[PDB]
Amino acid sequence: LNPGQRIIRDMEPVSHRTNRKPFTTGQAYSKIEILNRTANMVIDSAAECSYTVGDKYNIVTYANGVKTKTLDTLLNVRPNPFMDISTFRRLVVTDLLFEGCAYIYWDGTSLYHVPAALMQVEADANKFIKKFIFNNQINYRVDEIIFIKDNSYVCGTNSQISGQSRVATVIDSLEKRSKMLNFKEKFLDNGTVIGLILETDEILNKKLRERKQEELQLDYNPSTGQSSVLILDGGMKAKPYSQISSFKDLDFKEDIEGFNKSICLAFGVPQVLLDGGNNANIRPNIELFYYMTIIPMLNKLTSSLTFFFGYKITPNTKEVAALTPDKEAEAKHLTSLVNNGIITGNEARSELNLEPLDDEQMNKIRIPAN
Amino acid sequence: LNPGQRIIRDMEPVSHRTNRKPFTTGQAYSKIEILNRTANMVIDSAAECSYTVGDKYNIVTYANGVKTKTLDTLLNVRPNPFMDISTFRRLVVTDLLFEGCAYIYWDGTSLYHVPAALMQVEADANKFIKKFIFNNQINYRVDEIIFIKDNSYVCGTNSQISGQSRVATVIDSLEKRSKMLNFKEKFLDNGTVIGLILETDEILNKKLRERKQEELQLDYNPSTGQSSVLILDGGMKAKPYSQISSFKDLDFKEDIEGFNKSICLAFGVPQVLLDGGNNANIRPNIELFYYMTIIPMLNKLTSSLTFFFGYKITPNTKEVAALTPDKEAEAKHLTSLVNNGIITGNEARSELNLEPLDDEQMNKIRIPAN
Amino acid sequence: VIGLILETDEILNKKLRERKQEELQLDYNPSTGQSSVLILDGGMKAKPYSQISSFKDLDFKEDIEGFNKSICLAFGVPQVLLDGGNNANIRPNIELFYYMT
């Protein structure tokens, strides 16, 4: 046991909600299209990757007596007798994203989801965590909650608990982008556009002055008029005016592009995926996105699962439509291994997502020799 | 024993925390998003690399009697009876990053984590280190704590104690970038936009003047108007004004890009990882990131581990999704090695992350000979 | 940073002058205002001022890049290692760094 755990409790007795302003985040996700699309692709991608359970670690875990097949079916087919697999996975991933942490309940035989927007974790004076408090009055325990924590540095010191919300960091950038974009719309709806100013030093009958004003407006526009010369009489003067604040000054494109690139940067999506990319970009960018962004996100979940159940669980995609291996190269390398005897044919079948055959000559290596 | 160790202790009796301002760093991590993404990539990438324990060094280390398999389980499956593997690695790496150093406690059988933001190291007049003081009154020892130090040159002389926090070098750049970015939104919300400036040397009825100023603004906006000509009567003049301080002057984009490269440079992540890259950019840049940045960072940890336990521990990834070898090239070199008899087939499978199979012909080198 | 410089050759009650200054500031900003034309009465003029020392003059970026290259030069680290490199850039530069430095 850790002799310094009680000081850890004293320095942070309870978890801290990190999505400091939730309503602004919800408003932006609802009515801002870069956050909407980026969060949607991240969550949907973290919902397509299947989980493959491995061997049993001969250790004591919080959940014991669960067989491999039951865990596999509840984790890849249907978690709860009442809820979907993709819905539950998306809920967990969106809790991990929009909130710092993500929480999953564990019944006797079913694996329920609990939102992290209301749960608060209370540290223990002795071990690691005393008891979770969902909103209030729940008081789950610890053996029945799967804890997913995204790394955080909140307040002075990092925390054994809680988590820092990825979406909560882009709120300032989203507000800046929205204000900067609304400024152009209001500038267009407000700024005045004129084509000609005439001046006279004597008052000339406001009614008739206005009538001549619309006469000049309609008559000297090539779409609706067929005149191009003015003969000003009586000393009326034409002031050579200029435009005060032209639209060319408001060059917000570069700043808006910077804000968009930053927002795509925080979630981790490459900018090429949202745009159109060449053949040299699409496959490497899909690989970079999925692996280096999502697979940490799912690795947190799978590590928490292998802590909770003791079964080695890893994010093994091998089936997502975005990372389907190149058929020619994959076939070439699998055939090379099969011919040269490194792997059996059945393993190649398993890699090709086929089903192994109960054949004799395939279950043993070829060993070409001669 | 070192004759000069007492002078070393006299020149620096105790360690000193190097993250001089923790709260500003926390607020930057929580509300500045380039820093969030860079730190998250570094920490998560430093949490995916598995650890392989090698042989036993016949030396007297601080931890004795620990079995190889028990150390492997503690270091790759479950460090604690109460906390995860990914969470533990993430805490250790974020302590190494945001603070200068990182500390890991060691019970008889459990390998607990302790924060480095609170704990101070006291040098020894004779050997190396008297003890470790966690805030106070705990007073761990040295025989039971694992010490991971990031190289530092603080004050006049470099220290065998303490350490330099990489993030603390970035706070000034973060403040500069935040101020520079806030200046643009404040300039937009504060600057004035004018369409016309009409003057008269005599007073024209403020109420009716304001009514005409609303009518004249709404009438000459082509979105909401059907007039474009002015007939100024009574001697009212139109001053040919010009915009005083246009927005085109504030060319902050290059400065903000410089500050973004500022933020990313200190952590070590290449700028291509954040953006999109070609076939020739993604995998080489991920290789640079992992190797050059992370693997020294985990090499500090593994060197401290091999000091503590005496077992050769190295960061052996071989499984991280972002460094999966090219299937075709990997197949080609493995098959060539197997055919030409340099390595056995079983160790080829081992390098393929599969399970070696107990065969008679495969356990020996093929020896092509003819 | 200034938007307007309106001038008057007579004194006009500092308190209300400041009040109208604030009102005309807030009114003629499209973000927080819904007006774009200004009618000046009483002989008040509008001086066509200009920006004295614009931020565009301070082009420090090239000098700052030179200083960064100079700092990275003394230690020996190639500039490609810190940035992103292609297949042709990255491994020869890692080799040059390790070996030569």
Residue numbers in the entry:
A (entry chain J), B (entry chain K): 11 to 380
C (entry chain L): 203 to 303
Quote what the paper states about this structure.
We built atomic models for the portal, adaptor, and tail terminator of urea-treated empty T5. In contrast to the mature T5, the DNA and TMP are ejected in urea-treated empty T5, resulting in an empty head and an unoccupied tail tube. The release of the TMP and DNA in urea-treated T5 results in an empty tail and an empty head. A structural comparison of the connector complex between the two states revealed that the connector did not undergo any global conformational change. Structural comparisons of the portal, adaptor, and tail terminator proteins before and after DNA release indicated that no discernible conformational changes had occurred in these regions during infection. In the DNA-ejected state, once the interaction of the tail tip complex or baseplate with the host cell induces the release of TMP, the large space of the connector complex enables the passage of DNA. No significant differences were observed in the conformation of connector proteins before and after DNA release, and these proteins appear to be conserved across myophages and siphophages. However, T5 and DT57C lack a stopper in the connector complex, suggesting that the dodecameric adaptor may assume the stopper function, serving as a docking platform for the tail by binding to the tail terminator protein and ultimately completing the formation of the connector complex. Notably, the tip complex of the empty particle became detached for urea-treatment-induced reasons.
Bacteriophage T5, a representative member of the T5-like family of siphophages, serves as an excellent model for studying the assembly, infection, cell wall perforation, and DNA ejection mechanisms of this phage family. In this study, we used cryo-electron microscopy (cryo-EM) to determine the structures of mature T5 (a laboratory-adapted, fiberless T5 mutant) and urea-treated empty T5 (lacking the tip complex) at near-atomic resolutions. The T5 head comprises 775 copies of MCP gp8, arranged into 11 pentons and 120 hexons, forming an icosahedral shell with a triangle number (T) of 13. The T5 tail, which comprises 40 trimeric rings of the TTP and a distal tip complex, is connected to a unique five-fold vertex of the head by the connector complex.
